[PDB]
Amino acid sequence: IVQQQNNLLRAIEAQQHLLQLTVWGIKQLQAGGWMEWDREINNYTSLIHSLIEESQN
Amino acid sequence: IVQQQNNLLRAIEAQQHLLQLTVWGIKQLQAGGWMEWDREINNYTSLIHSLIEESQN
Amino acid sequence: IVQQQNNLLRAIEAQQHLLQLTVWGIKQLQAGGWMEWDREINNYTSLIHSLIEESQN
Known part of the structure; x- marks a missing residue:
């Protein structure tokens, strides 16, 4: 189960x-109305990085 | 293993x-030939929601 | 834990x-400067397929 x-x-x-x-x-395609989308992409990207680093540790 | x-x-x-x-x-970028892509996005989105809710429970 | x-x-x-x-x-939206993006999408797609098939087995 550890290997899995x-x-x-x-x-x-x-x-x-x-x-x-x-x-x-x-x-690259969008490059202005995307500020909230960028905020959410950044927050969830940081969130997932924290969870991956937690899992790795 | 539960925590992981x-x-x-x-x-x-x-x-x-x-x-x-x-x-x-x-x-937002596409906004017409995308009907099948929308069907598949919807089906897989519903599928993943069901699997996440199952896992949460 | 197996079911999870x-x-x-x-x-x-x-x-x-x-x-x-x-x-x-x-x-479909991009369809030329995307060669490295395509290389990385292909490599990670192959990588994830290998990990999913490993996990399934």
Whole structure:
């Protein structure tokens, strides 16, 4: 079960990289009315980083 | 292992919020040929909500 | 705990489908300077597929 929990964390980490690439792609396409979307992307990005670092530890 | 499973669920929840923000961003940029993409986004969004609520319970 | 690990894997699988739909949506909007973004999307997509198949097994 330990090995499976490590697998799932590595999957979540790799999905977060993919998510960050899609956020970056959307910002390149939008580049102004997006301030609240940027606030929420930033807050949830920081939130997920904290949870991943907690899980890694 | 219980604490780790809670960590991973909170990470998946925070990633789902980020995913929903990226879907919303893409819909704002597209705003017509997207009907099947919308069907699939809706079905998988409902699917993930059901799995998160199951996991929370 | 086994049932919970299966729940979380199914959630990660459903999120990967959603992620792939958002990548596809972004590529339709961009359709040229995106070569490195495509390389990284491909590498992380392959990485996550390997981790999901490992977890399923």
